[PDB]
Write an enzyme that holds these catalytic residues in place. Structure first.
Site, PDB file in Angstrom:
ATOM      1  N   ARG A  55       0.840  -1.174   0.000  1.00 37.93           N
ATOM      2  CA  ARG A  55       0.000   0.000   0.000  1.00 37.93           C
ATOM      3  C   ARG A  55       0.888   1.241   0.000  1.00 37.93           C
ATOM      4  NH1 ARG A  55      -5.308   1.549   1.495  1.00 37.93           N
ATOM      5  NH2 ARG A  55      -5.468   3.389   2.927  1.00 37.93           N
ATOM      6  N   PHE A  60       1.593  10.588   1.679  1.00 43.01           N
ATOM      7  CA  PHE A  60       1.249   9.981   2.980  1.00 43.01           C
ATOM      8  C   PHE A  60       2.273   8.994   3.462  1.00 43.01           C
ATOM      9  CE2 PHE A  60      -2.375   7.322   5.029  1.00 43.01           C
ATOM     10  CZ  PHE A  60      -1.853   7.539   6.271  1.00 43.01           C
ATOM     11  N   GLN A  63       3.601   1.469   2.963  1.00 44.89           N
ATOM     12  CA  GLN A  63       3.443   0.436   3.975  1.00 44.89           C
ATOM     13  C   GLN A  63       3.859  -0.899   3.451  1.00 44.89           C
ATOM     14  OE1 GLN A  63      -0.220   0.580   6.159  1.00 44.89           O
ATOM     15  NE2 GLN A  63      -0.238  -1.570   6.679  1.00 44.89           N
ATOM     16  N   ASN A 102      -0.701  -0.952  12.711  1.00 44.51           N
ATOM     17  CA  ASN A 102      -1.459  -1.756  13.685  1.00 44.51           C
ATOM     18  C   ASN A 102      -2.925  -1.825  13.405  1.00 44.51           C
ATOM     19  OD1 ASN A 102      -2.911   0.337  15.202  1.00 44.51           O
ATOM     20  ND2 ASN A 102      -0.870   0.957  15.939  1.00 44.51           N
ATOM     21  N   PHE A 113       5.294   1.282   8.326  1.00 45.33           N
ATOM     22  CA  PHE A 113       5.181   2.242   7.282  1.00 45.33           C
ATOM     23  C   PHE A 113       6.296   3.298   7.319  1.00 45.33           C
ATOM     24  CE2 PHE A 113       3.068   5.744   9.597  1.00 45.33           C
ATOM     25  CZ  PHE A 113       2.580   5.041  10.684  1.00 45.33           C
ATOM     26  N   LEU A 122      -1.239  10.510  13.852  1.00 45.55           N
ATOM     27  CA  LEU A 122      -0.797   9.232  14.284  1.00 45.55           C
ATOM     28  C   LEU A 122      -0.042   9.183  15.625  1.00 45.55           C
ATOM     29  CD1 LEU A 122       0.137   7.713  10.888  1.00 45.55           C
ATOM     30  CD2 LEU A 122      -2.112   7.663  11.998  1.00 45.55           C
ATOM     31  N   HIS A 126       0.487   5.062  16.910  1.00 47.27           N
ATOM     32  CA  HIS A 126       1.449   4.209  16.248  1.00 47.27           C
ATOM     33  C   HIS A 126       2.817   4.459  16.821  1.00 47.27           C
ATOM     34  CE1 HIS A 126      -1.312   2.904  13.002  1.00 47.27           C
ATOM     35  NE2 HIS A 126      -1.912   4.018  13.372  1.00 47.27           N
TER      36      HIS A 126
END
Ligand SMILES: Nc1cccnc1N
Length: 165
Positions: A55, A60, A63, A102, A113, A122, A126
């Site tokens: 992904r 952004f 991942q 997660n 990521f 985040l 995370h």
């Protein structure tokens, strides 16, 4: 203690692209750093080599790390399927931050990521555990293979990985 350095050698549809290295913040998050390091060397008998960045959202993150289901639904840590959020000392300050994916509180496995933007929302959910050291250019080139929904236009793999001196 010197924080460990890990590398990924990235390929795009099997073609070599370049190397990304990472500093792992063992000084602040030793348990999370050690899981990433060990998955990167494959010393427990499983890990990231040959796995995919499944992904990639430009603007952004990139991942990866799902070596059991190859799609964002799997992975496992060196400590068991899941382990706890170690701490939230480190924040998601900008491009290059390495952080755990997660599926809720205390559900870290192997998925991670690499930020390509600041991702402050985040923070505190995370666990941040490292940063790109060299090869942000290579992360930027990976990132161009992503899309708004995350699906990549070419297959981006970790052709090789391990620990540097
Ligand atoms: N299992 C799992 C699923 C999604 C994201 N991270 C994980 N560790």
């Amino acid at each position: 203690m010197v924080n460990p350095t890990v590398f990924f050698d990235i390929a795009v549809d099997g073609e070599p692209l370049g190397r990304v290295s990472f500093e792992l913040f063992a000084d602040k998050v030793p348990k999370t750093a050690e899981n990433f390091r060990a998955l990167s060397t494959g010393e427990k008998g499983f890990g990231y080599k040959g796995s995919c960045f499944h992904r990639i959202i430009p603007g952004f993150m990139c991942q990866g790390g799902d070596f059991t289901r190859h799609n964002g639904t799997g992975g496992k840590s060196i400590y068991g399927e899941k382990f706890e959020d170690e701490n939230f000392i480190l924040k998601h300050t900008g491009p290059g931050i390495l952080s755990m994916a997660n599926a809720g509180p205390n559900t870290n496995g192997s998925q991670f990521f690499i930020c390509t933007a600041k991702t402050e929302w985040l923070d505190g959910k995370h666990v941040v555990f490292g940063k790109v050291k060299e090869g942000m250019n290579i992360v930027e080139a990976m990132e161009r293979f992503g899309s708004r929904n995350g699906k990549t236009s070419k297959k981006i793999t970790i052709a090789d990985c391990g620990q540097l001196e």
